[PDB]
Amino acid sequence: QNYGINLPITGSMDIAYALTSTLCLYYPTEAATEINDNSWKDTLSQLFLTKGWPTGSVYFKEYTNIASFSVDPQLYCDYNVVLMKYDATLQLDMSELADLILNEWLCNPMDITLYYYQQTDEANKWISMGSSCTIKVCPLNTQTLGIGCLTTDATTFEEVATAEKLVITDVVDGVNHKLDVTTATCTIRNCKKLGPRENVAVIQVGGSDILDITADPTTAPQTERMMRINWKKWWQVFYTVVDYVDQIIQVMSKRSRSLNSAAFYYRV
Amino acid sequence: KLTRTRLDRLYGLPAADPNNGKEYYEIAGRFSLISLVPSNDDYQTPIA
16 A cells, blocks of 8 residues: 555564465476377376366476577566576576576666666676677777777677677676677667566576576575486476475565565566 | 692681681670788777
């Protein structure tokens, strides 16, 4: 009722206390190709039914290749779980995918053909999503003079990523830069890292864990929303993540942006 | 073939009339020219 005016709230330590939550699971391909059945979905459905969860509440959206899944990951669902098939050769992309879809980025768009830019704080990054991004950046001193790159043309800058679909740069704060991409291929947005996102849980099925979400070198934390399990037959991975899906669900929480009370607080 | 001659089996275009009074031969064909140009791309200039 009284919204958007953050007023203190009185609780108490004096009184003890004595369904509509929707799991929304994703999954990769070679798993499926090895499953060798078209009813597995129905088996998962009936199992969840016996576990206390309604039928018709769980949906399976499939991603083909990890780099393909990197674009536009609008994971809109009451509770989200992402099982990623690990690679010993595709690592940084997994780390940044985790970073993106586990945090909340509020971003504004840019027009690099015209404007200079500059990052502001250790919580400001540049996300870049699309087909084939080839970032071109050229730092500047205080009165717009090229440093290690020539601004009188375009092809002498210092590239930071090639053959990438989704990459999130972090630049030295407090200095202006010239920028180029192919603005018919992919798009870059200047995002502020507002606060952790709690709707999603990412678990990895493969080699060793690599996950960190802070682009800070010093702080490489292990959150709870990042889990790891081994495998030699995907059947057991599915069965098991449903065996403990109770604990997984109790770990996550409702998205602090869609709660009918997060009104006028960034998305509601 | 040269009329009123004793030599047989003669070849080669003549210096007599290589054009037959007609016009120049015309040929349309492409040509590639790969060369090491001298060209200062952008440098050696005021940085201002």
